[PDB]
Amino acid sequence: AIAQLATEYVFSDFLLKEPTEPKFKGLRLELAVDKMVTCIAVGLPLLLISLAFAQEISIGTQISCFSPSSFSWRQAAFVDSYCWAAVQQKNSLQSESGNLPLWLHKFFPYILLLFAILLYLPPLFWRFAAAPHICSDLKFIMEELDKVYNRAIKAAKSARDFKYPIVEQYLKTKKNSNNLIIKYISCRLLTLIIILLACIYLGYYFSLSSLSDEFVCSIKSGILRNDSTVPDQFQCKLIAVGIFQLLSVINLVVYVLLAPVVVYTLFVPFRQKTDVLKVYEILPTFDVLHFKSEGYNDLSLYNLFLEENISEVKSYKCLKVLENIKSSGQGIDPMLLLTNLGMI
Amino acid sequence: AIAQLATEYVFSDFLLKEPTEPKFKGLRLELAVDKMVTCIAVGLPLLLISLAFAQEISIGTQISCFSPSSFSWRQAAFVDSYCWAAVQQKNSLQSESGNLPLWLHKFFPYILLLFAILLYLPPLFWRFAAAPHICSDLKFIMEELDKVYNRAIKAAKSARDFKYPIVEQYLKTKKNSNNLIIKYISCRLLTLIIILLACIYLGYYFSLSSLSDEFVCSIKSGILRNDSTVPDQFQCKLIAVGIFQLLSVINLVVYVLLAPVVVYTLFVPFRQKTDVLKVYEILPTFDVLHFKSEGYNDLSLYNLFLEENISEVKSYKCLKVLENIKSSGQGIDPMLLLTNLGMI
Amino acid sequence: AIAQLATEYVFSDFLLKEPTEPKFKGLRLELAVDKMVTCIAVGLPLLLISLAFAQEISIGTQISCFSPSSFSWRQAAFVDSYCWAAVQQKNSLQSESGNLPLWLHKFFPYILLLFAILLYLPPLFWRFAAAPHICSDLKFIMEELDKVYNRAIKAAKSARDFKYPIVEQYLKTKKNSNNLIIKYISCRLLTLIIILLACIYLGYYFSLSSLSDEFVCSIKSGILRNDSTVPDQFQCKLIAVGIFQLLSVINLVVYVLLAPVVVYTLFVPFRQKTDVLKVYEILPTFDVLHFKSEGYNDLSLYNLFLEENISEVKSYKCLKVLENIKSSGQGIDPMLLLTNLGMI
Amino acid sequence: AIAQLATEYVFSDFLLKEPTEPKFKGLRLELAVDKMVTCIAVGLPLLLISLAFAQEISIGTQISCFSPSSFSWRQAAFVDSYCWAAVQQKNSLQSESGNLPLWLHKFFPYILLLFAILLYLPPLFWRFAAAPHICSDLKFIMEELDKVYNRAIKAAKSARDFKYPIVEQYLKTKKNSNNLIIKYISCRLLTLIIILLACIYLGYYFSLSSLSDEFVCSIKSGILRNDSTVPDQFQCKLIAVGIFQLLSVINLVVYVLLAPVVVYTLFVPFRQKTDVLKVYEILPTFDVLHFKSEGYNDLSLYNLFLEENISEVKSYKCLKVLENIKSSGQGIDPMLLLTNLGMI
Ligand SMILES: CC(C)CCC[C@@H](C)[C@H]1CC[C@H]2[C@@H]3CC=C4C[C@@H](O)CC[C@]4(C)[C@H]3CC[C@]12C
Ligand SMILES: CC(C)CCC[C@@H](C)[C@H]1CC[C@H]2[C@@H]3CC=C4C[C@@H](O)CC[C@]4(C)[C@H]3CC[C@]12C
Ligand SMILES: CC(C)CCC[C@@H](C)[C@H]1CC[C@H]2[C@@H]3CC=C4C[C@@H](O)CC[C@]4(C)[C@H]3CC[C@]12C
Ligand SMILES: CC(C)CCC[C@@H](C)[C@H]1CC[C@H]2[C@@H]3CC=C4C[C@@H](O)CC[C@]4(C)[C@H]3CC[C@]12C
Ligand SMILES: CC(C)CCC[C@@H](C)[C@H]1CC[C@H]2[C@@H]3CC=C4C[C@@H](O)CC[C@]4(C)[C@H]3CC[C@]12C
Ligand SMILES: CC(C)CCC[C@@H](C)[C@H]1CC[C@H]2[C@@H]3CC=C4C[C@@H](O)CC[C@]4(C)[C@H]3CC[C@]12C
Ligand SMILES: CC(C)CCC[C@@H](C)[C@H]1CC[C@H]2[C@@H]3CC=C4C[C@@H](O)CC[C@]4(C)[C@H]3CC[C@]12C
Ligand SMILES: CC(C)CCC[C@@H](C)[C@H]1CC[C@H]2[C@@H]3CC=C4C[C@@H](O)CC[C@]4(C)[C@H]3CC[C@]12C
Ligand SMILES: *[C@@H]1O[C@H](CO)[C@@H](O)[C@H](O)[C@H]1NC(C)=O
Ligand SMILES: *[C@@H]1O[C@H](CO)[C@@H](O)[C@H](O)[C@H]1NC(C)=O
Ligand SMILES: *[C@@H]1O[C@H](CO)[C@@H](O)[C@H](O)[C@H]1NC(C)=O
Ligand SMILES: *[C@@H]1O[C@H](CO)[C@@H](O)[C@H](O)[C@H]1NC(C)=O
């Protein structure tokens, strides 16, 4: 039913499932905006496919040819099925709009499924190629941040009663390499191109005259070519073509609204803001150097992933509340850190 | 069946599922009133869609055109399907009420699903954008309250046998920022606007003459335009239009009753009452300062979320019972706190 | 529905399920490229089979013979079923394209299923014959790497405050044996041959005239051979043949794009690059000798499997970050290793 | 659907499920070749049964008798059902090929299911009679091997810083008894005989003229015997007989390819090679005596089961890597064993 399709595709965790494995425990591995874009671009065409053939919106068979009254039920069924299979056969049918509109009307669900698959492909390539590496690197970075926070609080407590910046060096090294950012931009660009092509196709499909679904059909090949009792042609109409056009314009609207989001996603350096690591600069055990901005490198992408999935880090949360309290400046950062006692 | 739909949509945890993740363990992340509003506004139109096409209420096909007796079954089926697809084609049909009523009668389930999706969108935006931040902040606040309660009871026990207000400073800082409250008000306002538009549409749909479902249909395009055996027109009726109007007025009543709730929700400062933190003011380790009221800021929203999901805090429950006992004044707050022995 | 099939076969973990057993905990046991190739080559033909007979794309029965009007419904049904069963019987039918096109049109789903099964066979043979051995060997190798890393860090810590290369000897011994690599190459080659044969078949099927689906059928055997009221022949058409050809060309395109991937897979020594063990050469407890390259031996395959599933090793990750930091050369490898404190 | 059947029967763990009980944790209890043979021989005929009546390959009803035009739909249905039930009644029908072909055409699914059940019976008898005993014995043997390995490594460590061969005596005793091997050979031989009988039946079924499915049917018993309006006979055809023959030849090919595998399985002593226990002979605590070869006794079968499910033993894996390293001979077996430190 329509409501069942809605529950499956919008109100359920459709493509929102976290990786089912212990390797990525709590790691999104995909930005929220990218996940939203993929979920829409994939589950919208599927939802429209399901809707267009819902038991309520669908009168019945997808084509009716209006055989003569003399024709029996199965003769008329032969006519309808023959014309359905003959939309491909150009000789059989003669339609003013041509045969491409008939092909599109017959295979619209296939085309929507193709667009959905093509849009799901780049996210899958990301999740299967560049996701494990970033997951491992980000897990190491979070562990290092937790360890340095613990060491700093222990030092502060000892004072009240190595020291090498490994994480900073690793981030600096990531500043050079750009394979991950190149893959990310390539997959986003392919998604954008697929969306644009889908928009072109949907606009063309919705621009039809709405009468191209009606085509003339001739079961006059073979032994029936010279038969007399059979009329030279029939009036066939492809039902649900109006529904297809409505859903196609809906998908076109959604995709044109979505494309600016993908373009904004492509410009990762601009998105790289609100320095996540700036909060850690007040730790004595952490060097006061952010050095993450203004670069078409994997460093900006790692900064984005950190700003996305750093809320799960207790040390980061503690430092964030310390920073927020520092806005008033009533107290002292080391005193607040010592009082917090948030090692684990 | 009707009962199955009821069990799925009203008697089950439809959209009442808690976040399936360890990050939010026991945190609602959504006020009870907001959750009720979203659940109604989403699962009502879906329930009505399912009901309108239930196997019992539905006689059968959604349109019947009453072809002549001479017409065969599949000729009549062609007529019915053609008219169903031609509700869009204005030239084919001539109805007194126009063609918009026919469009609405055909696509009412789609319109209800659209309203449900549009009403579910703002809650989803909230849960995916502003929910993680408030979850982390509120978890930190609850942990700080538990820790300060433990410290105060330990101090009392030591007396019988830092001290910095970090949580108060954090709340004071939240008094300034307003991004969360702005997002909350924006999503509530969008929900209200969607509800009002849905009410307008449902009132228009229910105000129809009830005879607009009957339209005249002409299969007279193409080779059949000059055919003689076919009548110039047919009498088609869109079945289930009365059911659609009944369910639409039901949804209109529900939404007009719900809109005052959304308006009341918009005025969060008025809702900010029954100070949750007032109970903690009797703790020696906690400063006697509430400072949370009369502000279009995130502080009021945090106060609401606390008053919502603070019952899970054992320290808060203990302080609440101490406060309630203090109404009589027979005993002493520190003595009762020491006797409680409710560290964990 | 079409969307359900898509969810099952592309958006779900179809053939992507990890081995359901404690023996292989986190071990892929199959390279990512090989898994992708198998998943495509298997779940594409199945998806096309499901699509070709979807409730929306399918008009109805797969063959209609257009019995005379005098014929009753069940007489026409007998004609259709007889011709469906007589596509095999060459005498009954006379078609210009022959009888092989009719066989193919009738049994296309069977042929796609056969290709899917034949393509799934070599992966299954691998997973049931050569997977347990490589799993055990690789688990031992990872355990040895973890143990040597722990020993080296313990030695470094002791200095700050046996020694036999068992793993290196085992890898060197693997350099000689080649049964695993021979099995891998044989299964890949069989997969490639099956893909090529499938491409040949699909090209032949798509090269048909598109009118071979229309064949002449004669129910004139037995008592009906000399019957007069029955016409000497009927015009039968195999519906969905156009859909079969469309999906067959789609599968042909996918398989021709996939075959280069399989050919590249066959050349494992070229794939053996980015020495995984090179990072471990900086450990005092590990001998400085890689000795893994330029060989049609199981050593290259083991190197590939290591480069695939070594990210799960904490010691390997730590050594990798040490290597990446060494690019700048600011610090010292032993000092960084001591500071890391990543025993477990 | 066809793809669903494929997923259930070839791509899923059909009859590949490990024993669902804690008694056999990780013990196959069935050789890989035997499991493959059983899985094929059982799930192939079931798959063919499901395929032959798939919603796509099946035109409709399994028999059509071509009643006269004067006959009504339910008169024709009576004719078809009567002939379907009268394939057994020899007097009613007169077919050139006889009545056995009609029996076979009607009950082919039953015959395939019978063959599948008969082939599944011997494996079930094994798993319910001789599997628990071998499971217990093999678990004891693995535990003894682990214990002796632990004792030997402990002795080596003590030197660096009872002694009775219970397992060897148990294996020697198993050398005498042969009940398990006799049961194994009997079940394999019964499986082979069932496969041969199935091949005979399938060859006979596929050797039919392909026109035996067409039989003459006479509804002329009872009050209708002397009725005039009813024709003396009808032309009935059993649909799907061609599909049955195709699938039967497929099953015949599979079974003839499989029978050599079963014959090779029967010769267990030849399969008994690559002495698993030879690796343990280098342990000081283990006597240097294999004494397992060249015997129609349970010892060879136990050797096969060990070679199958010994990879799960850490001590065996360690000894195997020690053996492989000994190929070069660079080091010493006791030194390598001491350095390994693989007690558990
Ligand atoms: C997804 C991508 C590939 C879709 C590409 C656009 C498709 C949907 C449409 C939009 C405009 C279309 C073209 C418009 C006009 C003509 C001229 C005609 O004489 C032949 C077909 C041809 C050349 C059409 C082919 C298909 C076409 C290119
Ligand atoms: C992503 C955005 C830009 C998509 C907007 C849809 C655009 C591309 C659509 C809307 C209307 C469409 C046009 C409608 C009609 C025709 C006439 C036909 O003979 C050739 C294609 C052509 C000229 C179409 C080309 C594509 C088109 C311009
Ligand atoms: C969800 C929102 C967009 C719904 C908006 C209201 C819809 C349901 C209805 C209510 C009143 C309607 C209008 C009433 C009268 C007319 C005048 C007529 O000559 C053209 C249509 C037009 C202009 C209608 C368009 C659709 C309309 C605006
Ligand atoms: C949220 C609350 C206010 C909704 C209450 C429903 C109201 C808005 C409904 C109920 C009856 C409706 C009217 C019924 C009939 C017509 C005549 C038509 O030619 C134009 C629209 C118009 C004038 C409708 C406008 C909307 C309407 C006034
Ligand atoms: C999967 C593998 C086995 C498929 C092999 C190719 C199949 C699909 C096709 C492609 C070309 C075909 C051949 C083309 C021409 C002829 C000549 C004709 O007089 C008899 C059939 C015969 C000999 C065909 C047999 C089937 C054939 C070989
Ligand atoms: C893997 C790649 C190479 C596959 C590409 C498809 C090729 C092999 C296909 C496409 C068109 C096909 C041809 C189409 C028509 C005929 C005529 C027929 O009488 C014999 C087979 C023959 C000659 C086919 C042989 C195979 C063929 C050449
Ligand atoms: C599974 C086992 C039992 C199958 C045994 C073979 C079956 C399928 C077939 C193969 C050959 C067949 C026989 C061939 C010829 C005749 C002679 C005829 O006048 C009576 C039936 C009889 C005697 C057939 C009986 C059934 C038969 C034995
Ligand atoms: C396991 C292997 C050997 C099976 C190979 C199938 C063999 C046994 C099949 C293939 C063709 C079959 C023959 C086909 C036709 C007839 C004629 C009939 O009047 C008696 C049975 C008889 C003589 C069949 C006996 C069995 C048969 C020889
Ligand atoms: C049909 O009859 C015409 C008469 O002109 C003839 O040309 C044609 O070949 C016939 N077709 C068939 C299929 O017999
Ligand atoms: C139908 O016949 C009329 C007669 O006036 C003619 O004008 C019209 O073009 C014909 N239509 C078709 C589709 O042939
Ligand atoms: C049909 O009648 C013809 C007349 O020539 C005869 O040859 C043939 O044998 C008959 N067929 C049957 C099945 O009785
Ligand atoms: C049918 O009529 C015949 C006439 O010869 C007679 O012999 C036979 O008994 C009748 N059968 C029945 C069932 O009445």
Name the neighbours of B, counting chains with at least 3 Cβ pairs within 8 A: A
Check if A200 has its Cβ closer than 6 Å to any atom of ligand 2. Answer: yes
The per-residue b/e assignment along B34-45, b for 16 or more CB within 10 angstroms, e otherwise, is beebbbbbbbbb
Residue A231 DSSP SS3: coil
For chain C, the straight-line distance linking the first and the last C-alpha, in angstroms and rounded, comes to: 49
The reported resolution of this PDB entry, expressed in Å, is 2.8
- How far is B168 from A321, CA to CA, in rounded Å? 11
Best substitution site from D224, D226, D228, D229 to test ligand 12's pocket, by max atoms within 8 Å of Cβ?
D226
Instruction: Tell me the DSSP string of B178-227.
Output: -HHHHHHHHHHHHHHHHHHHHHHHHHHHHTS-S-TTEEEE---SGGGSS-
**Residue C64 host element (H or E):** strand C63-64
- How far is A68 from A72, CA to CA, in rounded Å? 9
Q: Could you give the angle at which helices D179-206 and D298-309 cross, rounded to 10 degrees?
A: 80
Pair of tokens at residue A70: 């003399």
- How far is D239 from C86, CA to CA, in rounded Å? 9
DSSP assignment letter at C249: H
D341 C-beta neighbours (distance < 10 Å), count: 12
A-contacting residues of B 86-145, CB under 8 Å?
A: 87-89, 106-107, 109-110, 113, 116-117, 120, 128-129, 132-133, 136-137, 140
Among residues C296, C271, C292, C291, the alpha carbon closest in space to that of C181 is found at C296
Instruction: Tell me the DSSP string of B216-267.
Output: EE---SGGGSS-SSS-S-EEEEETTHHHHHHHHHHHHHHHHHHHHHHHHHH-
**Breaks in chain C after residues, C-to-N cutoff 2.5 Å:** 161
CA atoms within 13 A on the CB side of B342: 19
Atom of ligand 5 nearest to the CA of C104: 8
A32 touches chain C (CB under 8 A): no
Residue C249 distance to chain D (closest CA, Å): 19
- Select the residue from C8, C9, C11 to test the A interface by mutation, using most A Cβ atoms within 10 A: C11
* Cα dihedral A223, A228, A229, A230 in deg (nearest 10): 60
B-contacting residues of A 43-72, CB under 8 Å?
A: 51, 54-57, 59-61, 64-67, 69, 71-72
- How far is A293 from A273, CA to CA, in rounded Å? 8
Residue A212 DSSP SS3: coil
Pair of tokens at residue C42: 């298997």
Residue C215 DSSP SS3: strand
Residues D192 and D259: beta-carbon distance below 8 Å: yes
- Looking at the DSSP bridge assignments, the partners of residue C214 are C237
**Breaks in chain B after residues, C-to-N cutoff 2.5 Å:** 161
Atom of ligand 7 nearest to the CA of D204: 10
What's the Cα-to-Cα distance from A103 to each of A108, A191, A205, A241, C246, rounded to whole Å?
A: 8, 25, 11, 12, 11
Cβ–Cβ of D336/C176 closer than 8 Å? no
B24 touches chain A (CB under 8 A): no
**Residue D238 host element (H or E):** strand D234-238
Nearest CA to ligand 12 atom 1: D226
Instruction: Tell me the DSSP string of C69-113.
Output: TTS-HHHHHHHHHHHHHHSS-TTTEE-TT-SHHHHHHHHHHHHHH
- Looking at the DSSP bridge assignments, the partners of residue B64 are B237
- How far is A146 from A166, CA to CA, in rounded Å? 13
Among residues C82, C95, C220, the alpha carbon closest in space to that of A222 is found at C95
Q: How was this structure determined?
A: cryo-EM
- How far is A211 from B253, CA to CA, in rounded Å? 40
Among residues A104, A111, A110, the alpha carbon closest in space to that of A215 is found at A104
DSSP assignment letter at A107: H
Among residues B167, A79, A139, the alpha carbon closest in space to that of C314 is found at A139
- How far is A333 from A325, CA to CA, in rounded Å? 9
Pair of tokens at residue C34: 């090989």
What's the Cα-to-Cα distance from B338 to each of B160, B310, B311, D275, rounded to whole Å?
A: 9, 22, 21, 74
- How far is B96 from B85, CA to CA, in rounded Å? 19
Residue D11 DSSP SS3: coil
C-contacting residues of A 275-314, CB under 8 Å?
A: none
- How far is B305 from B139, CA to CA, in rounded Å? 11
DSSP assignment letter at A19: P
- Gyration radius of chain D's alpha carbons: 30
Instruction: Tell me the DSSP string of D93-123.
Output: EE-TT-SHHHHHHHHHHHHHHHHHHHHHHHH
What's the Cα-to-Cα distance from D272 to each of B198, D33, D200, D276, D321, rounded to whole Å?
A: 78, 14, 32, 10, 22
Q: What's the distance, CA B131 to chain centroid?
A: 16
Considering only the beta carbons, identify the residue of B62, B82, B136 that sits closest to A317: B136
Instruction: Tell me the DSSP string of B84-100.
Output: HHHSS-TTTEE-TT-SH
Cβ–Cβ of D11/C42 closer than 8 Å? yes
Residue type, D73: W
* Cα dihedral B89, B92, B93, B94 in deg (nearest 10): 110
Q: Please report residues of A whose CB lies closer than 8 A to that of C279.
A: none
Question: C21 CB contacts (<8 Å, ≥6 apart)?
Answer: D18, D26
Alpha helices in D277-330 (DSSP H): 298-309, 314-326
- How far is D142 from D316, CA to CA, in rounded Å? 9
Length of chain C: 344
Alpha helices in A53-99 (DSSP H): 73-86
Cβ–Cβ of B78/A216 closer than 8 Å? no
- Looking at the DSSP bridge assignments, the partners of residue D215 are D236
Question: A198 CB contacts (<8 Å, ≥6 apart)?
Answer: A45, A115, A119, A251, A255
- How far is C344 from A89, CA to CA, in rounded Å? 68
Question: A46 CB contacts (<8 Å, ≥6 apart)?
Answer: A9, A112, A113, A116, C2, C3, C6, C7
**Residue B222: left (phi > 0), alpha (psi -120 to 50), or beta?**
left
Question: B254 CB contacts (<8 Å, ≥6 apart)?
Answer: B40, B44
Nearest CA to ligand 7 atom 9: D201
What pairing do the DSSP bridges indicate for beta strands B214-217 and C93-94?
A: unpaired
* Cα dihedral C253, C254, C258, C259 in deg (nearest 10): -40
Residue D66 DSSP SS3: coil
Question: D94 CB contacts (<8 Å, ≥6 apart)?
Answer: D215, D216, D218, D233
DSSP assignment letter at A214: E
Strands laid side by side in the B234-238 sheet = B63-64, B234-238, B214-217, B93-94
Q: Which residue has the tokens 């009797």?
A: B282
Pair of tokens at residue C56: 């929306």
Spacing, Cα A190 to ligand 2 middle (Å): 21
The per-residue b/e assignment along B233-255, b for 16 or more CB within 10 angstroms, e otherwise, is bbebbbbbbebbbebbebbbebb
Cβ–Cβ of A211/B221 closer than 8 Å? yes
C334 C-beta neighbours (distance < 10 Å), count: 17
Pair of tokens at residue C18: 């990890």
DSSP assignment letter at B135: H
- How far is A18 from A21, CA to CA, in rounded Å? 9
Pair of tokens at residue D277: 């226990």
- Looking at the DSSP bridge assignments, the partners of residue B163 are none
Residue type, C53: F
Chains B and D touch (3+ CB pairs under 8 A): no
Residue D286 DSSP SS3: coil
Residue type, D15: L
Instruction: Tell me the DSSP string of A127-171.
Output: HHHTHHHHHHHHHHHHHHHHHHHHHHHHHHHHHH-----HHHHHH
- How far is D81 from B77, CA to CA, in rounded Å? 31
Check if A196 has its Cβ closer than 6 Å to any atom of ligand 2. Answer: yes
Among residues B127, B134, B130, the alpha carbon closest in space to that of B306 is found at B134
Q: Which residue has the tokens 């992933």?
A: A305
- Looking at the DSSP bridge assignments, the partners of residue C235 are C216
**Residue C237 host element (H or E):** strand C234-238
Q: Which residue has the tokens 């190459």?
A: C185
Return the residue of C nearest to A129 by Cα. Answer: C32
Spacing, Cα B113 to ligand 4 middle (Å): 21
Q: Could you give the angle at which helices C314-326 and A131-160 cross, rounded to 10 degrees?
A: 80
Cβ–Cβ of B81/A67 closer than 8 Å? no
A13 touches chain B (CB under 8 A): yes
DSSP assignment letter at C152: H
Alpha helices in chain D (DSSP H): 2-9, 32-52, 73-86, 100-129, 131-160, 166-176, 179-206, 241-266, 268-271, 298-309, 314-326, 333-340
